[PDB]
């Protein structure tokens, strides 16, 4: 599929069917988007929403989170699992208070330098909260791109990962970047699922190589 057609079809789908009313999407800030991305990394949306609301009520700014005792952060995290995320969350809040005056940094290198934040989460924070022109590559996005463009091979091998990052950059537009990056996460979470994808509901079905060959099970590749 030509990249400009990919972007236009995904944006038209989002306008009619996309999720726009999650709490981190209303009066968006870098702090709210960062907190939601860390909670969503390993936990479903329905479980995350009450924890997001409790964290924002207790810690209205990143300085309030930084100044709290770690034991209180761990207590409020209880039930989310994968507590390395919470230890890194508290360290990153302290780095923003100490190096950046309590104001979330707005440059890619300073965001990616935070503990718990890699290349995809840094691009998510700056694209979704401020409209900066960065692509994302989480598990949802890897599945949609690898099926549509027939990218075989395990993404745990550097050459496969690099091919996927180049494809993601190519299809991600500048105009509408915040809508496009949320739409790709919606598609991989609800339509282009691990098993038995819902291709009849998918805005890419007219150009997707996996759909044309009924070969979704080949993409992305699994670890050998
Ligand atoms: S048409 Fe089917 S396999 Fe292709 S991107 Fe959409 S849901 Fe995934």
Q: Briefly, what is this?
A:
The protein is mostly helical and 224 residues long.
Break the fold down into its secondary structure elements and pairings.
Elements: H1 3-17, H2 30-40, H3 45-58, H4 62-67, H5 70-77, H6 84-99, H7 108-112, H8 119-130, H9 139-149, H10 158-171, H11 177-190, H12 209-213
Helix pairs in contact: 1-11, 2-3, 2-8, 8-11, 9-11
Tell me about this structure:
With 224 residues, the chain is mainly α. The protein folds into 2 domains: 112 residues, Helix-hairpin-Helix base-excision DNA repair enzymes (C-terminal) (Endonuclease Iii, domain 2); 112 residues, Endonuclease III, domain 1, CATH 1.10.340. 58% of the residues lie in helices and 0% in strands. The chain has 12 helices and no strands. The protein is elongated and about 55 Å long. The structure holds iron/sulfur cluster (SF4). Iron/sulfur cluster binds next to helix 9 and helix 12. The PDB classes it as hydrolase. Keywords: DNA Repair, hydrolase. The assembly is monomeric. Crystal structure of the core fragment of MutY from E.coli at 1.2A resolution.
Strand segment count: 0
The CATH topology of the largest domain is Endonuclease Iii, domain 2
Instruction: Count helical runs.
Output: 12
Number of spatially distinct domains: 2
Give the SSE string: HHHHHHHHHHHH
CATH superfamily of the largest domain: Helix-hairpin-Helix base-excision DNA repair enzymes (C-terminal)
Q: Please state the second-level CATH architecture of the largest domain.
A: Orthogonal Bundle
Radius of gyration: 18 Å
Shape: elongated
